[PDB]
Design a protein around this ligand. Structure first.
Ligand SMILES: Cc1cc2c(cc1C)N(C(=O)/C=C/CNC(=N)N)c1c([nH]c(=O)[nH]c1=O)N2C[C@H](O)[C@H](O)[C@H](O)COP(=O)(O)OP(=O)(O)OC[C@H]1O[C@@H](n2cnc3c(N)ncnc32)[C@H](O)[C@@H]1O
Length: 375
């Protein structure tokens, strides 16, 4: 039996970021089912940072994370966590009212957002089919995230603060015993006053083991693939390209191109595989919008983006289940919100107010709380 101050289930970006901030204040033990910590959604993302994306709460958490990403503590990482990658959202269907709505809402949050005409969009990504382009928004502040450096920075930080990150430690039974949570794994048992449920698509499964009413979390499959660009064109500086209805996205990645149909097909929590239909649809949509020819993709995969009803993230104690803390519903935003989520969740776990720099971005405890959800 191992005793901790904070017992975290899940070592993805959610558990790693929360554990990182908690580890300055007490003993953190993170239990991870897989042999490695980033095998599920945290290892499967498009690795992009976009402020004007998601609900208002998501946008606030994303904006509030930028300070840490651009200036992490000494020793956190060897190289920058972000690299410049503007986002261009292109209207391919002739919907000027929607284009203007997105421009105005994005510009209110990102003053440098621009409205482009068709020629300006085609200048930036020359493979766009000019006949299909009706304008675009352009966000000069988008960035690519070095997700492995970020994730490993969080995990190493836990260990440097005398915490533990224990892989091959699936939580199998969870019980509140004598004022603390006790978790049984095949490889040992663990006890702590606080159980941090950071289990990704499995958060409601963890609540089920504990007898705690679940959130209603819905995992949703998104597939993606990498393909070769034509050898005679330099796409390495292209922005992240998205269609106005998020029917697809396309971004450069290590001399290749990363594409996706940006799907959200509801599925159960599992080790999700790409569906051939997902890949075919993404290929079709990119070829409809651009002059690219996509041969058989070099690599395809899928991951889970998990949401509650309102599309917002969840960080808070469960009502009437003392010490059970949700860090859940990261949706399509878990990487880009992770610094603010980790800092906010650690403060709330410790029953402290949210730090000033988070409240100034317009975050409060209530809009993170799970109590907002079910009747
Ligand atoms: C698939 C995917 C996902 C994303 C994306 C793409 C694709 C293709 N991107 C986008 O399309 C962006 C579109 C932009 N579009 C417009 N601009 N217009 C994206 C992104 N996000 C982000 O910011 N930027 C991105 O660019 N996403 C989302 C992030 O992928 C996601 O939100 C976080 O990764 C979630 O992280 P979590 O930490 O919640 O989840 P987890 O990594 O699965 O970890 C849980 C751990 O619990 C363990 N576990 C379970 N049960 C137990 C147990 N019993 N015992 C012990 N351990 C247990 C489990 O084994 C696992 O290890």
């Amino acid at each position: 039996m191992i005793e901790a101050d904070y017992l975290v289930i899940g070592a993805g970006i959610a558990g790693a970021s929360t554990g990182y901030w908690l580890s300055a204040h007490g003993r953190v033990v993170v239990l991870e089912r897989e042999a490695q910590p980033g095998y599920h959604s945290t290892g499967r993302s498009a690795a992009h940072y976009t402020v004007a994306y998601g609900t208002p709460q998501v946008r606030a958490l994303t904006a509030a994370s930028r300070a840490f990403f651009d200036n992490p503590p000494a020793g956190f990482c060897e190289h920058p966590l972000l690299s410049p990658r503007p986002e261009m959202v292109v209207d391919f269907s002739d919907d000027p009212e929607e284009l203007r709505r997105q421009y105005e809402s994005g510009k209110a949050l990102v003053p440098q957002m621009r409205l482009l005409d068709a020629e300006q969009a085609c200048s930036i990504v020359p493979v766009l089919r000019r006949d299909k382009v009706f304008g675009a928004t352009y966000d000069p502040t988008g960035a690519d995230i070095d997700t492995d450096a970020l994730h490993q920075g969080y995990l190493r930080g836990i260990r440097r603060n005398q915490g533990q990150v224990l892989c091959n430690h699936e939580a199998l039974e969870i019980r509140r015993v004598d004022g603390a949570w006790e978790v049984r794994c095949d490889a040992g048992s663990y006890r702590a006053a606080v159980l941090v449920n950071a289990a990704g698509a499995w958060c409601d499964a963890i609540a089920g083991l504990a007898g705690v009413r679940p959130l209603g979390l819905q995992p949703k499959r998104r597939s993606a693939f990498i393909f070769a660009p034509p050898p005679g064109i330099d796409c390495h500086d292209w922005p992240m390209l998205v269609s106005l209805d998020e029917s697809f996205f396309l971004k450069p990645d290590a001399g290749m191109l990363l594409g996706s149909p940006a799907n959200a097909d509801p599925v159960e929590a599992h080790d999700v595989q790409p569906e051939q239909l997902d890949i075919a649809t993404g290929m079709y949509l990119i070829e409809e919008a651009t002059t690219l020819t996509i041969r058989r993709p070099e690599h395809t995969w899928a991951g889970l983006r998990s949401f509650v009803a309102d599309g917002d993230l969840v960080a808070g104690y469960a009502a009437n289940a003392e010490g059970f803390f949700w860090v859940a519903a990261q949706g399509g935003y878990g990487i880009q919100t992770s610094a603010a989520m980790g800092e906010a969740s650690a403060a709330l776990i410790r029953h402290q107010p949210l730090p000033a720099h988070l409240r100034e971005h317009g975050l409060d405890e209530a809009m993170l709380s799970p109590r907002r959800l079910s009747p």
